[PDB]
Each structure stands twice: as C-alpha cells, then as structure tokens.
Write a protein that binds this ligand. Sequence first.
Ligand SMILES: *[C@@H]1O[C@H](CO[C@@H]2O[C@@H](C)[C@@H](O)[C@@H](O)[C@@H]2O)[C@@H](O[C@@H]2O[C@H](CO)[C@@H](O[C@H]3O[C@H](CO)[C@@H](O)[C@H](O)[C@@H]3O)[C@H](O)[C@H]2NC(C)=O)[C@H](O)[C@H]1NC(C)=O
Ligand SMILES: *[C@@H]1O[C@H](CO[C@@H]2O[C@@H](C)[C@@H](O)[C@@H](O)[C@@H]2O)[C@@H](O)[C@H](O)[C@H]1NC(C)=O
Ligand SMILES: *[C@@H]1O[C@H](CO)[C@@H](O)[C@H](O)[C@H]1NC(C)=O
Ligand SMILES: CC1(C)CO[C@@H](CC(=O)O)CN1
Lengths: 403, 407
Amino acid sequence: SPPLSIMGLMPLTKEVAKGSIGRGVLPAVELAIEQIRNESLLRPYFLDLRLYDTECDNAKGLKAFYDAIKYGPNHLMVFGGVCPSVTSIIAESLQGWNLVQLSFAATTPVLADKKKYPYFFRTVPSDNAVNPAILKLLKHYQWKRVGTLTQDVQRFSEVRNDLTGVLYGEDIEISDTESFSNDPCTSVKKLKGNDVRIILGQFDQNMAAKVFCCAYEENMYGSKYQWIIPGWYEPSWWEQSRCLRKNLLAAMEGYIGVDFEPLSSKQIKTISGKTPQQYEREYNNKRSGVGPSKFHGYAYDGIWVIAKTLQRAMETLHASIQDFNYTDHTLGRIILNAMNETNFFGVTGQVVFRNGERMGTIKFTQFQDSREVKVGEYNAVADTLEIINDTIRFQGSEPPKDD
Amino acid sequence: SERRAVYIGALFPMSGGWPGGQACQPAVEMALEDVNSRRDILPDYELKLIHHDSKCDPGQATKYLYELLYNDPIKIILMPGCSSVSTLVAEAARMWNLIVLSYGSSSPALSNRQRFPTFFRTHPSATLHNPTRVKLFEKWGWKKIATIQQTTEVFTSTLDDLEERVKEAGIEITFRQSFFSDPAVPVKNLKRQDARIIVGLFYETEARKVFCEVYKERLFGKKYVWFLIGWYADNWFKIYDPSINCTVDEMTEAVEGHITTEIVMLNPANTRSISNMTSQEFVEKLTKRLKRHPEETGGFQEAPLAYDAIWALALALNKTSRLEDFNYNNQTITDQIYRAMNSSSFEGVSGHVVFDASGSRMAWTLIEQLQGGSYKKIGYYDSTKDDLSWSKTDKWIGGSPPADDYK
Ligand SMILES: *[C@@H]1O[C@H](CO[C@@H]2O[C@@H](C)[C@@H](O)[C@@H](O)[C@@H]2O)[C@@H](O[C@@H]2O[C@H](CO)[C@@H](O[C@H]3O[C@H](CO)[C@@H](O)[C@H](O)[C@@H]3O)[C@H](O)[C@H]2NC(C)=O)[C@H](O)[C@H]1NC(C)=O
Ligand SMILES: *[C@@H]1O[C@H](CO[C@@H]2O[C@@H](C)[C@@H](O)[C@@H](O)[C@@H]2O)[C@@H](O)[C@H](O)[C@H]1NC(C)=O
Ligand SMILES: *[C@@H]1O[C@H](CO)[C@@H](O)[C@H](O)[C@H]1NC(C)=O
Ligand SMILES: CC1(C)CO[C@@H](CC(=O)O)CN1
C-alpha cells in the first residue's frame, strides 16, 4: 500500500486564535479520509495527509512549509492555508516545487490572481463572491440606484473595488460612494443627504454597531431603507456609545446579511453517498468537545477534490507517482489539469472551479427582531437566486424604492 | 594557520522591476576580493558568497531562500536586493537567527523593528527624502503644503512619514490627493483648492500622465512649485508615450522649475574611503567587470551601496570574531553581530556609512531644479547633522520663490 502524501498546512495550536479553524475542520477531514480508505477509491495507494502547524504566522508558516519539504515525505500537493498573509506567501511560491494547492478557508480576493498564484485553488468562495449574489438581489427587487459604505481596511476596500466591475454594464447606479476609518457618522449623514435608500455596507463587526447607531440618529432605517451588509458576524454581535440597545435593534431591523453557504440545503446524496444533512450529523458526532467550524464542509469537500484529482492523475499516467520529487514539472501540470476538471456534488453543493476560484453558494440572511434568519440563496454556477417565499419581510406594503 | 570560510547568502535581482543585481553582484564580488586581501580586516576568516537570481520576485526568492537555508554550508548573513524580496527574507529570518542586510531596498515599511528584528540596509529608506523636503520648506518659509500620490505602498508610507515630520516643524498638509493609474481628478482638485507648494510621489510612467494634466490645468508657472523624486531617467518628460495627449514642448513647459530630491549613492568628493579607492576608481574598476555598458547595467547607481554593505559586514564581523560555531538555533552570535552592525561608522565608496535605530542607512540627499529643460544641482542635505550645502544656482520666475497662499 504505497502512500500519496499531502502537505496539510493550517494553524493547529490552542495559543493561536485561528487554531480553532484548523482544529474545527480536522474531524471533517478525518471522516473524508476514513471513507476514501475503506472504499479503496485510490487503490493500490492510500491518502497520506501530513499535518504541519503554520501558527497563523508568516515566519513560522514558511519554516513549517520548508521543514515539510526537507524532512517530510515527497508531497504531491498542498492542502490548506488559512491565514491570508501566510497562504499568499506559500501560494506565490508553489511553482518552485511544482505543488498544486487547495485551500478550504483562505477567502482573500488577492488569491484569484492567476499571474501571481497559478498553482492555487480553493473550495471556499472568496470575499468578492458576495458581489454577483448582491447583483441578483438588486435585479430581483428592481433596485437600480445604490449607495456604498466601506471601512478603509483592505479586507473591505477589496470587496468595494470588485463591486465596480460587477455593476458595470448593468442597470445599476452607485449614486454615492462613502469611506470611513474610525467613525461612520459623517459618511452616514452624506448618504442620507444624497437621499440614498439601498446601502451596500462593507465593514467589520465592531464598526457595524457604530453604523447602525448613526443610521438610527439619521433615521436611515424602516420602510424606506435597505441595508445589505456582511453576513459573517458572530451571533449576538450587537449585544457584546450614544445609542441604546433598543434604538440599535430598531435601526438593525430588516438588514440583509451576505456570506458563503456553509453546507448545501438540498436533501440529495453527495459523492460520498451521504446527504449534506447526514454528513452534518456524522461531523457533529466525530467533533466531540472540539468547537465546530463553518469551513468544515469545505475541508470535507476539499479531501474529495484531492482524491478525485489523484484518481484522474493516475489515469493520465496509466494512459501512457513514486518518482515524483518537487522536480517533476510534468506531474505538477497533470495534477493541475486534473483539478481544473473538478465537477461533483459535495456537502457544500456542486464543487466546480472557474480559474482556481470556487463557483459555490451565497447565503442571504435578514435581521428579524432578535437574530439573522436565512431568506435565500445564490447559486454562482447557474447565476440564479432563490428567495425563501414567506421569510423575507419589509416594514412597508412593498419593498423600498431606490429613490 | 588555516583561514576558516564564512558564508553570505545573497539574492540578486538580474531581471524584474529593479534589475539591480546586474551591477550589484560584481560590486559585491569586488568588495569580497578587497576585504579578503586586507589582513587587518578578518585575518582568521575568508568571506565567501553563495548567491541566486531572485528576478526581483518574492515567489522566486522563496525557492532560493529554502536553497540557502536547507543546504550546507551554514550562512551567517542574508543579503537581498529588492524591497519585496527583503520584506519576505527579513520577516522569515528570525526563525533561523539571521541578520539581513540589504543593498537595494528603499521601502519605508522595512524600518519596522517588531516585524524585521535583524534587518539592516546600506540603501536608505524612501523617507530620507522627507527631512530634505521639510528643510526646503523651512528655507523658503512655507507652512502650507499639498500632496499628490500614486496608490502604491511606498508612496503611502512616504507621505505618512511626511505628515509626522511636518508637524514637528510647524508646517501643515493642506490637501492630500491620490490616483491609481489615471491622474486627471487629483490634478483638477489641486487647481480647485488653489494649491501652490505640491509634493508629487509616483513612478516615471505616472509622472508623465501627471505632468500632461498639469499642463492642461495650467498648474505650472511662477505660482507653482513641484517637489518630485530625483531618480527618473534623464529627459523623462521628453519620452514618447502613446497614452499621452501632450507634446515634448508642452511637457517641457509644465516641468520647468520643479525641485527633485535623491539619495547620494556615490561620494561627490575626490577623497579615499576604507578600501583606499576614490569614487571615480570604483566606477572605473566596476565598468571593467561588466559585460555591458554602465547605462545598460541595472543598479549601476546602487552598486556603491552593495560594495559598502560587504565592508559594513566585514567590519562588524571583525569587531566580534567564534564565527565557525554559528547555528540557526542559536541567537548568541546573531546578537553580537547586530550590536556590531548597529555601531557601524566608516567611510565607504557611497560616503559615510551609519544606520539609524531601525537599521536604515543615513545619507546625504542631492537637491536639483529643472532649469531650462535640464537639472542643475542646487544643493545637498545632511539629515543627521542638519547641514545644508547651498550653491547659489536656484532660479525662479520674477526673481524669487512663490508663497504657499493668496498673497
Ligand atoms: C592609496 O592611494 C595611493 C594609491 O595610488 C595607486 O592607485 C592604485 C589604484 C594602484 O594604481 C597603485 O598601483 C598606485 O600606487 C597610494 O599612494 C602611492 O603609495 C606609494 C607608497 O610608496 C607611492 O609609491 C612610491 O613612493 C615613493 C616614491 O613614489 C617611493 O619611496 C616608493 O618606493 C614608491 O616608488 C606612490 O607615489 C603613492 N602615490 C600617491 C598618489 O599617493 C597609497 O599608499 C594608497 N594607500 C594605502 C595602500 O594605504
Ligand atoms: C479548465 O476547465 C475549464 C472549464 O472546463 C468544464 O468544466 C469542468 C468543471 C469539467 O466539467 C470539464 O470537463 C469541462 O470542460 C476548461 O475551459 C479549460 O480548458 C480546462 N483546462 C484543463 C482541464 O486543462
Ligand atoms: C580588525 O579588528 C581588529 C580587532 O579589533 C582591529 O585590530 C583591526 O584594526 C580591525 N580592522 C579594521 C579595519 O578596523
Ligand atoms: C532609488 C531606487 C531606484 C529605489 O528603489 C530601489 C529598489 C527597491 O526598493 O526594491 C533601488 N533604488
């Protein structure tokens, strides 16, 4: 039984905050590996995932990668990369060792640049993947005029910059573009002043509370307003200075949150023979005391992408693995072309790549009294939107008008 | 009886954004010959070079950094050229307890000690232009300044430093404008706000675009003073660019009287340095070692910094000397070299070599003014000693410099 060695790169230590991602996804990785082994899907071989702790640090992550190449087995590909600056460093260097990388958690838009990161693939949609979803939401509700509110931090300005290209050549006008660093009130008053009704917000959890307080003071809430903001904030994020909690909640009422979908809502059998719901129960049992991670299904489908890629690679070599050292440009290209052929229905939905980028599912949520409620989903493959019939609500008789 | 070999791990950009390795690899090679032949420098040791071509590319450099660290012999120092390669190697370095010495990185971000704990550079930071800028404002009595920049990390960091340095001198930044690739709007906004003293930070291609827009809005003349970077090619405004609406004469009109600042990389004085060479001798010796002409050789101007980097290292290693016992797992030797590198004070081919608290080179700046479509050396400035070498060659419309406001 020869090994097919894979370089696992992620934060794993309890001392590192993002170590919760790496630990939260391992039961999911263990489940995928266990199945593929039992079924002997890679017969005669077996999947040899080796784990190396990046510690979410540029220097330590690089040494973890270097040590894996020096002392570790001859890895065929990279699995992981969680923290954005660590993943960028490894992802840029990939071709030096003819290593194809598949990430399940790095969502930074930067990585979509195939001139800089040609050997990099990801099963998770990037931060920019909300923009085509928002376009469909705007078209659905006939919102042809929007305002933007962005925090002056790279994570958010990257998203706002991509929106320009997504809305170009589309029937949508950005009447007002406002930026802020520490206090959003000036920008919120400018938005009100320009009579903006539909706001596309891009800011962190801490700034969101400030935004909604300024919205309450400027009366930029209720029947005439629609706030479309990030959907990745922690639950009860608002509970955690001039506004009262009741006044914040009044202004927060009806906001649309946008984020990637953690698991498929379709009760259909996936590549493993299990439905996403069945997989979720199996994951929850295997995890034990380890806190769940929203990237678990992406890590699970990630293992299947590797096994299916290796299968296709094995066929290509048989149509004409042990001897592969980071020297074999040909095998790296075989593995590269095989991963680009990826097309199966996984726990996160249909797993397909478009220039190393995942074409996946975007979740829409709406703040309803006390929490975010799922109101719809965007299928990036089909470029379609499905709004949940009797969930999404408006304070008026009709959804708000854009002017 | 036996000289022990001690190794430098270098990276040279032979191609890419700044192909500085072209003249910096031979300049380093010359400096190693000169150091090894001197019996008063490192008598017990022989300094050897192991190098790779980074192509001015961090991804490419990541392959070679592995090759340098994961292969025998153990290297005692790392020597990168490009700012992007230096940011990668200087952050990684702490994991192997290595000193990093750059001969070509100008990035202001490399002056961060928390992030780059063992970093030194014979090349000054792009921020070295700022004390000269503040001193020129002080000389011509200006307290209100406008700033236009191209959206790049180096220009953002340079302006951020300019902010804290103007506050110290009782000068304020009136208006700050920026552009990614097209400069029509910030130029239009500069005429709008009646800006007079303007610091412009952009690359040569963008400078051409800026100055064509400067023409149309008539942002040149007696009222206007432009503060630009002094390292563009000669007759940059005269260079043909299809994306340019303006003419050579049009551009020549817009550029007249603008001030430039640039780091002095070769001592203008005819004095002899620690190597016992003069500036002209170094230039002559380096030209002989080159396959192509100095003008066709990348990093020819930076070559003296690469030469002096070897001397800085040799003198630091000499102040310490148990060099053969160096290991990546141990800080002890690193810490002593750091202390010796920190206390560097000598005369090199580039002039007096000293590093500030950040490990960044302290040097003279050359102040120039575009007089009749050609640059004239109007002065020199020494930031550390507050010494301004002034030559009575600065020329203005009417007879004198304009004011920052309405007057
Ligand atoms: C620094 O500079 C001077 C080097 O000048 C020369 O340049 C080199 C690049 C190379 O071309 C070399 O061959 C040259 O000599 C050195 O100064 C020379 O030092 C010599 C020391 O004696 C001296 O010579 C004679 O000196 C008197 C008569 O000239 C005799 O008694 C002696 O035997 C030699 O014949 C020569 O005149 C002098 N020239 C100058 C211009 O100074 C200098 O020593 C050197 N410094 C060092 C090495 O520390
Ligand atoms: C890259 O894949 C691109 C899209 O290919 C289609 O989609 C995938 C998911 C599969 O179903 C595949 O059979 C389809 O052709 C191609 O345009 C591109 O040429 C591919 N290059 C490769 C595989 O080397
Ligand atoms: C070398 O160091 C030794 C010991 O400190 C010293 O004697 C010698 O002068 C140094 N060489 C130079 C050029 O300083
Ligand atoms: C003066 C200049 C052109 C500034 O960039 C340096 C290259 C770099 O910073 O990477 C070299 N010398």
